[PDB]
Symmetry: D2
Subunit: 260 residues, 4 copies
C-alpha cells in the first residue's frame, strides 16, 4: 500500500502509463496523469481514478519534448498533489528506419522525449524528494536499453541513455531515502507496438494475429506479451519498502528477451 | 498471496533463507526448510512457521554438496508438500583467499554448493513444475554474479555460473508457466558477512561497527545493508502474477553496487 | 597495415583522437583530422602526419554539435580522401555537476556532441561504406557507457547511448563487410581529465600528482592511466582482418574499472 | 611481436587452440601444446611449429579435468619453456540436453574442464608471472559466458564462471604487469560445432551446409563463422603492449551475437 503517496506518471493517457497510474491509485496514491489524447477520454480517465479508487487525480497537459515545459510540469504537479513522492518517467515514442535513412527530426524527437525528458523531469523532482528524505524515480526503459535491434537507432540510443541516467541518479542519491530504477519491458501490445505488428503484416502478407506471433517469436522466448498490469505491479513493487535498497538497476520484464 | 503454494527453500536455517521461508509462509505457502544448525533451533523455526502463519512446514536435512542427496531432497520435499511450486536455491558458503593460495578443497566445496546444487535442485524440480504448468525457480546469486572482487575466485565463478544457469533454465521453460530468475543481493549482515567484517576489524585495528561501515563503503553506495526481509519481499514479488513474464533475469538489491 | 585506407578521426586535434590519427597514419592510412585548437598547432599536426608517415592528411574544421555540419564534414572528408574506409567518432566534452544543478545547456551540448554527432557521422559515412562493401566505424565511448559515476548525468547518458547506437549500427550492417564497435577507455590523462584532477586537488588541498593518484584509485584498479597510444593500437586492431567478425561490441581498456 | 615469450595453450591439438598456438609461434613465442588426438598428428603439429616458425615447441599430454594434473602440467610447461609469460586456457567440451535430462556426469565433466581447469591452471601460473612482473592469462570463454541458449546448462554455467573468474584474476593482479581477459567467440566451425550442425541437419532433414547456415542464422547476425585465425589474432593483440591496461574484460568476436 502506498496510502498517502503522491505520484506523477508521464505519458499516462495510453498504454503502459495508463496502467501505471491505475495501479498506483489502486495502492492508494494520489496521481498526476499527462499525455496526449481526446479530452473526453482523458477526463473520463482522470475522474475514473477518483471514483473507483478514492484518490485525487489531476491531468496536466505538457509536451515533454520541451525542457522548460517538463520542468514546469513537475512544479505544477507537485503543487497539485501537495508534494511528490513517486515519479514514473514513462512517455516515449518510436520510429523505425535504418540509420542512413533515419529522419534527423525523428532522431531529435526521440532523444528529446525518450531521454532528455527523463533528465529534466528527474532534475525538477529531486529537490522535493531530497527535502523529504524519501522518493522513487521509476524510469521506463526497454530491453532496448540493454540490447539492440535493427532500424531503431534513436530509440536504442535513448533507452541505453535512460539506463545510464538511472544509474547516475541512483548514485547521486544513495542513502538519501531516494531510489531510481529502470523497468525494462519486452513487447507490450500498446499502440506503439501495434504499428509495428501492422508493418510486419503488410511486409509478410499475413493477418494481424499471425504478425503479432512473428513479432514475439523473433525476440521474446515466452511467446507472450508482457501486460501493462504486470508493469504496474512492478512499479508498485519498486515503490515498496522491500525495494528500499534496490537502486540504480534494471528490472527486466521481457519474457526472456535479454537471457539470450 | 501465495495461498495454497508449496515452497522449498534450501539453506533456510539461517540468514537470508530463513527470512525467505518466513515471507513465503506469511504469504500462505507451505514450506520445506533445510540447512545445518542446532536441532532445537531448527525445530523451533519449523514449529514457529506453523503456529504463527498457519501453514505446514517440514525440515529436511540434506547436505546439498552431494548431487544425489540434492536430487533425493527435492523428491522428499515434493512428497512432504504434495507438490512443488516454488524452489528457492539459496544455500551457499564463502571463503576468501587469493587465487594462488585458494584451497583446492574450498574451490570444490563452493562450486559444489553454490553452483552444482542449483543445477541438481532445478533438474529435480522441473519435471514437477512442467507437469502442472506453473513454477518459480528463484536462485540466490549475488552482485558477485555480475561483477567481481578480489579474493573471491570460487564464489564469483560460482555466482556468475548461477546467473548463466538461471538464463538457460528460463529459456528452456519459456512460455510453460515456469519462470527462473536470480536475486542478486549486495551485502546482507548474516554470519557469512559477519566473518568478513571481523576480518576487516582485525586487519585495520578497529571496532566491529567501524569495520561494518568500511565493508559497506567500499562496495555499496547506499551505505546500508540489504535486509533478509527485503529479499523475502523480492521473492514474494517474483512468485506473483506481475512477474509471470519476468524470466531469465537478475533482480539486484544491492544499494547501487552494480550501478558503478 | 592499413595501407591505402582512408580514415577520418573526429576531435583529433588533442588527446586520444590525435593519437588515433597518428596510429592510423603510421599504419599507412590517409587521415582527415578535425577539432578545435590553435591554427599553427593544427597545421603542424597535419603536416607532421604527412612528413613523418608519408600519407595524405587534411584538416577539416567542423563543429560537430550541429547535425548538418557533421553530415557536410563527412561529405567533405570523403571528397578530400577519395573515399572513406574507417570513421573514428571520438570528439567529446565533459561537465560535472549533480543532476538538479546540471546546466540545461551543458546537457544539450554533451548530448549533441557525444551522442548525436556519432549518429550523424555514421549516417553520412554508411552509404560510402555500403557501396564498397568494407568499413569500420569505431566509436569512442567510455567505461561510463557501461557503468555510472556521480555528477556525470549527461556524459553517462550519452556514452550509454553511444554503446546502444554502436549495437544498432553493427546489426543493420551485419555481414556487409562493415563493423561497428565501441572502445570504452578508463581514465586517460588528457585535458578532459586534467580538469577533473585539478578539481580534486582543490577539494582535497593536495598537489596535482597526489590528486591524479586519488582519481585513479577510486575507479581504476591498475592504478595506471590508459594511454592514447594504447587506444590507437586498439583502433588499429579493430581495423584489421582479425576483427572482421568483431562487431556490435565494446572493447574496454580501463585498467579493471568494469571488472568490479 | 612476442619474440622471446613463453606460451602455453591448453587444448591446442585441434580447433581454436591449434590456431592460437600457431599465431603465437608466428609472433615469435615458444609454445607448449596440449590435448588429445592421434600421436602422429600431434607430433607433426609440434615439429611444424618449430620448422615453420623457428621457435621451440613441446607437447605435454595432461587431462585437465583433474586438478592436480592441471597444476602439474603448468609446472612441467614452465620447466620445458624456462618460464611462462602467456597462458591461454582454451581446452573445453560441449554436451547438449535439457536440464532435467542433462547427464550428471556430463555436468561434472564440463564444469571440471571448462571452469575448474581455468582456475587450477591460473593458480599454478600466477606465481611465475608475479615473480617476473609480467604476464597474460587469456581465457577462452564464449558468447555463452554472457548470454544463454537452450540445452546448454553446464556449458553456459561454466563459461559465465570463466568470465567471473577472469575478473577476479584481473583484480587480484591489477597493476602487477599481469592482465587477464576472456575472448568470447561466437560460432567457429570446429569439431565441437560440427557435431551440432550434424544434429540440426538430422532434425531438419537438410544437407550439412544448409544446417550450418541455419545454425548461424539463429544466433550470429553476420551469417559468417568466426575463424580460428581471427581468434589467434585477438590473442596476439591481448599479448601486446597496446593491451597493457586491458584487463578483467571480455573481447567478443561473435558476429553481432551479443549486440541483440
Ligand atoms: N510497448 C512496448 O512494447 C514497450 C516496450 C518497452 C518499453 N516501452 C516504453 O513504454 C513507454 C510507454 O509506451 P507505450 O507502449 O505505452 O506507448 P503509447 O504510445 O501507448 O503511450 C505513449 C504515452 O506517451 C504520451 N506521449 C507521447 N508523446 C508525448 C509528449 N511529447 N509529451 C507527453 N506525453 C507524450 C502519449 O500521449 C501516451 O500517453 C515508452 O517509454 C516506451 O518506450 C514500450
Ligand atoms: N550475506 C550476503 O551479503 C549475501 C550477499 C549476496 C548473496 N548471498 C547469498 O545468499 C545465500 C545465503 O547466504 P547467507 O548470507 O544467508 O548465509 P548463512 O551462512 O547465514 O546461511 C547459509 C545457509 O546455508 C546452509 N548451508 C550451508 N552449507 C549447506 C549444505 N552443504 N547443504 C545445505 N545447506 C547448507 C546453512 O546451514 C544456512 O542455512 C548464499 O547463496 C549466499 O551466497 C549472501
Ligand atoms: N580522457 C579520458 O579519460 C577519456 C575516457 C573515456 C572516454 N574518453 C572519450 O575520449 C574522447 C576524446 O576525449 P579526450 O580525453 O581526448 O579529450 P580532449 O579534450 O583532449 O579532446 C577532445 C577533442 O574533441 C574536439 N572537440 C571538442 N568539441 C568539438 C566539437 N564541437 N566539434 C568537433 N570537435 C570537438 C577537441 O577540439 C579535441 O580535439 C571523448 O569522446 C571522451 O569522452 C576520454
Ligand atoms: N567452436 C566454437 O564455436 C566455440 C565458440 C566459443 C567458445 N569455444 C571454446 O573454444 C575452446 C576450444 O574449442 P574448439 O571449438 O576449438 O573445440 P575442439 O573440440 O576443436 O578442441 C578442443 C581441444 O580441447 C582438447 N581437450 C578436450 N578435453 C581435454 C581434456 N580433458 N584435457 C585437455 N585437453 C582437452 C581437445 O583435445 C582439443 O585440443 C573451448 O573452450 C570452447 O568452449 C568454441
Ligand atoms: Cl534485430
Ligand atoms: Cl575488489
Ligand atoms: Cl561514483
Ligand atoms: Cl536459445
Ligand atoms: Na561495476
Ligand atoms: Na542478448
Amino acid at each position: 500500500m502506498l496510502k498517502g503517496k503522491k505520484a506523477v506518471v508521464t505519458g499516462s493517457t495510453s498504454g503502459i502509463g495508463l496502467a501505471m497510474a491505475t495501479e498506483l491509485a489502486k495502492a492508494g496514491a494520489d496521481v498526476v496523469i499527462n499525455g496526449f489524447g481526446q479530452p473526453e477520454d482523458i477526463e473520463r480517465e482522470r475522474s475514473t481514478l477518483e471514483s473507483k479508487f478514492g484518490v485525487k487525480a489531476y491531468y496536466l497537459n505538457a509536451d515533454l519534448s520541451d525542457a522548460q515545459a517538463t520542468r514546469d510540469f513537475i512544479a505544477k504537479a507537485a503543487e497539485a498533489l501537495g508534494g511528490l513522492d513517486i515519479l514514473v518517467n514513462n512517455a516515449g515514442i518510436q520510429h523505425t528506419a535504418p540509420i542512413e535513412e533515419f529522419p534527423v527530426d525523428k532522431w531529435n524527437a526521440i532523444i528529446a522525449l525518450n531521454l532528455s525528458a527523463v533528465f529534466h523531469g528527474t532534475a525538477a523532482a529531486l529537490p522535493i524528494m531530497q527535502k523529504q528524505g524519501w522518493g522513487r524515480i521509476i524510469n521506463i526503459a526497454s530491453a532496448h536499453g540493454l540490447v539492440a535491434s535493427v532500424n531503431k537507432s534513436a530509440y536504442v540510443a535513448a533507452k541505453h541513455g535512460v539506463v545510464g541516467l538511472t544509474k547516475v541518479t541512483a548514485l547521486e542519491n544513495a542513502g538519501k531515502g531516494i531510489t531510481c530504477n529502470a523497468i525494462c519491458p519486452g513487447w507490450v501490445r500498446t499502440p506503439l507496438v501495434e504499428k509495428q505488428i501492422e508493418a510486419i503484416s503488410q511486409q509478410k502478407g499475413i493477418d494481424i494475429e499471425a504478425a503479432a506471433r512473428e513479432l514475439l517469436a523473433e525476440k521474446q522466448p515466452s511467446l507472450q506479451f508482457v501486460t501493462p498490469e504486470q508493469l504496474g505491479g512492478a512499479a508498485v513493487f519498486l515503490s515498496s519498502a522491500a525495494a528500499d535498497q534496490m537502486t540504480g538497476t534494471t528490472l527486466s520484464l521481457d519474457g526472456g528477451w535479454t537471457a539470450r
